Design an enzyme around this catalytic site. Structure first.
Site, short mmCIF file in Angstrom:
data_model
loop_
_atom_site.label_atom_id
_atom_site.label_comp_id
_atom_site.label_asym_id
_atom_site.label_seq_id
_atom_site.Cartn_x
_atom_site.Cartn_y
_atom_site.Cartn_z
N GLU A 1 0.84 -1.20 0.00
CA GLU A 1 0.00 0.00 0.00
C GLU A 1 0.88 1.25 0.00
OE1 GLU A 1 -2.08 -1.24 3.60
OE2 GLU A 1 -0.93 0.20 4.80
N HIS B 1 -3.95 2.83 8.71
CA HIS B 1 -2.67 2.34 9.23
C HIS B 1 -1.70 3.49 9.47
CE1 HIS B 1 -3.47 -1.56 6.68
NE2 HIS B 1 -4.15 -1.58 7.81
#
Ligand SMILES: CC(C)(COP(=O)(O)OP(=O)(O)OC[C@H]1O[C@@H](n2cnc3c(N)ncnc32)[C@H](O)[C@@H]1OP(=O)(O)O)[C@@H](O)C(=O)NCCC(=O)NCCS
Ligand SMILES: CC(C)(COP(=O)(O)OP(=O)(O)OC[C@H]1O[C@@H](n2cnc3c(N)ncnc32)[C@H](O)[C@@H]1OP(=O)(O)O)[C@@H](O)C(=O)NCCC(=O)NCCS
Lengths: 385, 286, 385, 286
Positions: free
Chosen positions: D208, D246
């Site tokens: 990501e 995150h």
């Protein structure tokens, strides 16, 4: 350098670690007035000297009246306490610590030093408090628990917990212990300590941890960045000649013998004392000439060594350094002459112009035996005695 | 020989100070390959005919030096040692005395982790007679030879050097590991080096009270040293718990006495002498 | 979280690092009164918003009279400043920083962040101050100098010196720089920072270093042990819906689109937005359902997503978690029903009882399309728009 | 398989807490060899039929466990992770989310220095379908197989697992390296492990936005990975400078975008997919 128990407790307090309520007193009047400030008795009165074993020597007592506190104070202030850790003269008592009595349930041991072997700061905990830890070690080693501070991470709670559990603590006593562990570890690192000894670390009947006694030693080499510690040094607790020698860049330590030693270098100094002992002599001291052996510094050395009436002769052993033996020979002659040394002086020069120097010595006309070789020098001083 | 030789290029940290100047001068005279010094704020100038730099890194970039001798006062050694480790220096000789124990504790970890070698602190230096001299030791008493010397003290070492020079044996290399509690290198480190050194036929080990470096070396000598070793320990007449000059010369916890170390070295079959005067003799005996 | 420039300077001050003499003001009256407290003009007035590029937007000006300071303040207080680093709404200006003008000789750049690549805290210095450092980097990389803090030893003077010399400083400016380096490095470690940016770090005509501007970012994850920082958070500078979502354990970030997304998991959330974009859709937001997908939490999610008038449809994608799809299907139905969703809702359930749940959804009678497979779900929401 | 198998003995730190209890229970059911847990102050008791200890060291001494899963809240992880390293644990799985960056920075240095392996923090765990499960991932969607998975996210990983299970390929081992800025292990660490693993025939890499672990893995894959790799990157539609859930999902300095990583993986000859839905497909293509 060492600190007084009362000074150590004051520091533990600054770091939020439990200590009895007390007061350091310099006069019998302060001592008795402390009683009421503390609360209801009985009260504990303690002479304050750097050496340990104060109790066995009768410097620690539990009294029941202001009248008794006063008597204790008038009996010790000004006198010298002698413990199994002091010479025969003992140390001067210029402070009486007066504190509240504590209801002891159990005595533990918590200490810390710099383990030269593992090169780490190490904490030791034991359930055998109130006893010379050294004995616990050699006798019941499995009762001593240790942890080493990680240089990369600093002290960690899990380490304080580990010791607590190994000591069988439980309940709030576990957090209390960990807090104390973290605190002492922090002081150790922040104040550049060398030694820490909470003996005993007491568990009260009321169920709390409290430091009944405390011993701290600071790394002298770090005092240049420890302003507060620097100010707490108590000169009276050491041989005045020691500090006096340090001032002239000399390292001195008195012993029992009739032969003085003046050597340049700590190793060589000890080695020369040893060789004198080896040939039947009794070294009277240790004196390592740090700075250059100038006439002035050598003069101070003589004065300091000879301040001991036991000295009958003086062995001087100098190897090289930053000066020539002929120059050093002159300095020694100038020194002996100005001090007016009243005992035989055996000199041993070595290095650049070793012989030219031996000559000047042999011809000085003074009482100076110029030896040839270390063994010779040793035999002669032992002889002159 | 070990650690240094005639080709070792050396820079000096504290180059422009009193001791730094005096001893660098001596080294240059002895023939040591001094290529420049470092003194923050005096970069761009020249001293003793050599270039001065502001940082160790600049000095290395310009001279390719691989060794550095430190003459910086205690308060700033942790800083200058760590700067050297960072600049790429592989050998560091720290003469400075008075460094805080807790400082060396951290520096020692970094040294190992970084693979950098340091002799000291609080040492007279290192010398390979005839080839290279770094430190404050008098060169004129050494003689190219076969005996390697490892000592925790300074002037006491000169005694062994004089003797080995007088008996004609000479010295391969002299390493003073220093008198502090946590040195950069200990006995075992240097011993292993002498074992692999073909030029070294014998080893003189000089120790003193305090710690257990000697006891640990004993066991190591028995186990991994095949060449002959003569050992001397100073401090038999010393009292326990008192510091005798060197920050490391102190008997703590009643452990680490002179006799204790003699005994340990003997149980490992090391030729020990009880009179610093007989080192040369015992050597000849091998 | 981010701090205001005035808040950052106040912190640098606490750590003894030079900053202009100034005052944060909330009313035009405080602003003009600041002038005389500061000294003789001219004075600098600055709108305080988290975003940068305030200058280009006209939020930074140098004025010459109390009258002008007042005018500046009355013009910005209450309004929203829009910079190249804010959305179209810009950010509210509730504080005007009024400080003394500085005689600039040169502009430098000093910053620090946590380099994920080398896993160390790294400081950057450059002689190219007053410019977007990112540009300096890609264009003249050799003008950017760095040093990494050693975890085992902490910041060291030689590192501050290294940067100073690389920047060509000399004389007292070198020590001044090192002091600032040591200070910022210490703040960074002690306050658990994430970012530090002194741009520009100015050298005055008088020959001193001073922080003309400052930007700080703290590690949110560490606020539990940073009491002071915790109190400095300024909610007004962010989208209120974000903090509102966090309260219900949801992670939200608004975008430009007509398709809302409600997914459990940050990665899956981004992935679902991507797949919608892939099939010709325009994701309206990012909403990661942290806590369990209860009826209550899912309800809040809908309310928050739909608070954006642009939203025409909502794609729900939930994979497993700690509940069964049939239960989650009921919660979604209960939620849609109680909120009264006025747009198509495509749901995609997967995991335990995935089909039993799809069924309950297909039969809810509400406007809920129960998709089969992620690609299908994506095509349908894009369709419903 | 890698990291864990049917014989791995595992202890749980935070064993008596909410998540620790629930998931340890799931693990036991799955067949994981849970041998006990650690919760300071609750030592001497038993939980889930297993022994509870006061310290990690006690637990290891009694069970010989070599792996530990951590379910301790963030404020105390640096402490419990360092405790494990000290107790002798060799594999640490930290599920905890919210650990301070500066804390992981130090822990990471210690992990490397000590030779201890940690997966996480902020990860769903690790699982070798059919043999061992450690974490919070749903076991019923996995199937013993040949594809190895490495991901920075949680639920997104399940998509790849479902697909590989559906296409029948199955999984060798699934490793979630976590979503934090400074993880215990990164892509390259795990990749190298899959290369030496004979049971792993293909590799699925899920990343990501944020950082450069992916770009760095690309170069490494080109250079040292011979097995086929299918890669997926999430965050194409994400804005720069904003945290997307995150702690690690944030584009800083404008570097570390989704496309940037796709491009990087492609230049290294990695089969990249632009729809998380086609991972299973691309795999079959190899
Ligand atoms: C190291 C020691 C010799 C320094 O004493 P000194 O040279 O008189 O000190 P000076 O002040 O004259 O010079 C020190 C120089 O260090 C420099 N310095 C300071 N910090 C420095 C750093 N981080 N890096 C480099 N140089 C540094 C300065 O340049 C200074 O001199 P300068 O600014 O005037 O040029 C002294 O502290 C010492 O250790 N003496 C004992 C030596 C000993 O007996 N050793 C054991 C023998 S066995
Ligand atoms: C770690 C986490 C799961 C804890 O939540 P929790 O289990 O509900 O917390 P609890 O308070 O119930 O239990 C924590 C336990 O830790 C224990 N604990 C604290 N410090 C400890 C230490 N050093 N060693 C061992 N246990 C410790 C306590 O004993 C407590 O249990 P107790 O109830 O018996 O006292 C939570 O912090 C968390 O980080 N959740 C994030 C999950 C996540 O998103 N992961 C990413 C996956 S994709």
């Amino acid at each position: 350098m060492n600190l007084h128990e009362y000074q150590a407790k004051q520091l533990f307090a600054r770091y939020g670690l439990p200590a009895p309520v007390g007061y350091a007193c310099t006069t019998p009047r302060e001592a008795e007035e402390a009683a009421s400030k503390i609360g209801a008795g009985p009260w504990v009165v303690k002479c304050q000297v750097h050496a340990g074993g104060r109790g066995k020597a009768g410097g620690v007592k539990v009294v029941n009246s202001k009248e008794d506190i006063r008597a204790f104070a008038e009996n010790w202030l000004g006198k010298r306490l002698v413990t199994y850790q002091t010479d025969a003269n003992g140390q001067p008592v210029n402070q009486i610590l007066v504190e509240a009595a504590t209801d002891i349930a159990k005595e533990l041991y918590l200490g810390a030093v710099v383990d030269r072997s593992s090169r780490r700061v190490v904490f030791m905990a034991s359930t055998e408090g109130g006893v010379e830890i050294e004995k616990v070690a050699e006798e019941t080693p499995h009762l001593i628990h240790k942890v080493a501070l990680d240089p990369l991470t600093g002290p960690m709670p899990y380490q304080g917990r580990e010791l607590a559990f190994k000591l069988g603590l439980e309940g709030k006593l576990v957090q209390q212990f960990t807090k104390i562990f973290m605190g002492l570890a922090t002081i150790f690192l922040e104040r550049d300590l060398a030694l820490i000894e909470i003996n005993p670390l007491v568990i009260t009947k009321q169920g709390d941890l409290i430091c009944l006694d405390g011993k701290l030693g600071a790394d002298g080499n770090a005092l240049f960045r420890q302003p507060d510690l620097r100010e707490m040094r108590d000169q009276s607790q050491e041989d005045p000649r020691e500090a006096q020698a340090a001032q002239w860049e000399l390292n001195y330590v008195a012993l029992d013998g009739n032969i003085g030693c003046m050597v340049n270098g700590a190793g060589l100094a000890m080695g020369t004392m040893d060789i004198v002992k080896l040939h039947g002599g009794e070294p009277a001291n240790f004196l390592d000439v740090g700075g250059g052996a100038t006439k002035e510094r050598v003069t101070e050395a003589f004065k300091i060594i000879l301040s001991d009436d036991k000295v009958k002769a003086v062995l001087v052993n100098i190897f090289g350094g930053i000066v020539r033996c002929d120059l050093i020979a002159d300095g020694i002659i100038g020194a002996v002459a100005e001090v007016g040394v009243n005992v035989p002086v055996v000199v041993r020069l070595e290095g650049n112009n070793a012989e030219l120097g031996a000559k000047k010595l042999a011809d000085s006309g003074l009482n100076i035996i110029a030896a040839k070789g270390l063994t010779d020098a040793a035999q002669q001083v032992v002889a002159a005695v | 020989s070990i650690l240094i030789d005639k080709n070792t290029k050396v820079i000096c940290q504290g180059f422009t100070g009193s001791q730094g100047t005096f001893h660098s001068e001596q080294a240059i005279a002895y023939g040591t390959k001094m290529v420049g010094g470092v003194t923050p704020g005096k970069g761009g100038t020249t001293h003793l005919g050599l270039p001065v730099f502001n940082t160790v890194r600049e000095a290395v970039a310009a001279t390719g030096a691989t060794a550095s001798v430190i003459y910086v006062p205690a308060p700033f050694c942790k800083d200058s040692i760590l700067e050297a480790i960072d600049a790429g220096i592989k050998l560091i000789i720290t003469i400075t005395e008075g460094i805080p124990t807790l400082d060396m504790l951290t520096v020692k970890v970094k040294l190992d982790e970084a693979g950098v070698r340091m002799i000291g602190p609080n040492t007279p230096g290192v010398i390979t007679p005839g080839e290279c001299k770094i430190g404050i030791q008098p060169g004129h008493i050494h003689k190219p030879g076969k005996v390697g010397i490892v000592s925790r003290s300074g002037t006491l070492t000169y005694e062994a050097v004089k003797q080995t020079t007088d008996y004609g044996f000479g010295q391969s290399t002299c390493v003073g590991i220093g008198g502090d509690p946590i040195p950069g290198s200990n006995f075992i480190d240097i011993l292993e080096m002498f074992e692999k050194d073909p030029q070294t036929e014998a080893i003189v080990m000089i120790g003193e009270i305090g710690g257990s470096a000697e006891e640990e070396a004993a066991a190591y000598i028995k186990e991994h040293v095949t060449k002959p070793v003569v050992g001397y320990i100073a401090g038999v007449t010393a009292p326990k718990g008192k510091r005798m000059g060197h920050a490391g010369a102190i008997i703590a916890g009643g452990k680490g006495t002179a006799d204790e170390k003699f005994a340990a070295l003997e149980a490992a079959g090391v030729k020990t002498v009880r009179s610093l005067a007989d080192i040369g003799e015992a050597l000849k005996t091998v």
